[PDB]
Amino acid sequence: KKIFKPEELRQALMPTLEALYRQDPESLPFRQPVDPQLLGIPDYFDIVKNPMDLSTIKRKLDTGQYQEPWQYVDDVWLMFNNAWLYNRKTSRVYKFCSKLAEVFEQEIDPVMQSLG
Ligand SMILES: COc1cc(C(C)=O)ccc1N
């Protein structure tokens, strides 16, 4: 069972996260946590039980919170699935989510092969 050093796991996975952040405009609604109070959407946490966003993923990747690569992958998919569950299919958020998911799959596949 391969053990992962925290800084090596971060270096391996960081380019996949940077690829998401580089999408403009598609990363913009994902760069900060959904704040239902600021946005006036009190139903949000009734639907999204486990919020996730790029800034939280980055913080976790920077602070040794992912012991194995699949935990990072799970958080990326959680972010996407939250947005695809809460938002209209033709909404900006949903369409932007789909672009990020396209980019992510391209980026994570060879990385996971090299890790393993
Ligand atoms: C309230 O609409 C939003 C929903 C979302 C997500 C990610 O679901 C993000 C930013 C918004 N402004």
Q: How many CB atoms lie within 10 A of CB 66?
A: 20
Whose Cα sits closest to atom 10 in ligand 1?
Answer: 29
CATH number of the domain that 48 lies in? 1.20.920.10
Whose Cα sits closest to atom 6 in ligand 1?
Answer: 83
- The ligand 1 atom at the shortest distance from the C-alpha of residue 30 is 7
Q: Identity (one letter) of the amino acid at 107?
A: E
Domain that holds residue 27: 1-116
Q: Is the CB of 98 under 6 A from ligand 1?
A: no
Q: Is the CB of 38 under 6 A from ligand 1?
A: no
Indicate the number of domains in the chain.
1
**Experimental technique of record:** X-ray
| Residue bearing tokens 């639907």 | 47
Residues 83-94 as b/e (b if ≥16 CB within 10 A, e otherwise) read beebbeeeeebb
Can you tell me whether residue 113 is helix, strand or coil?
helix
Question: What is the C-alpha to C-alpha distance for residues 3 and 108, in angstroms, rounded to an integer?
Answer: 19
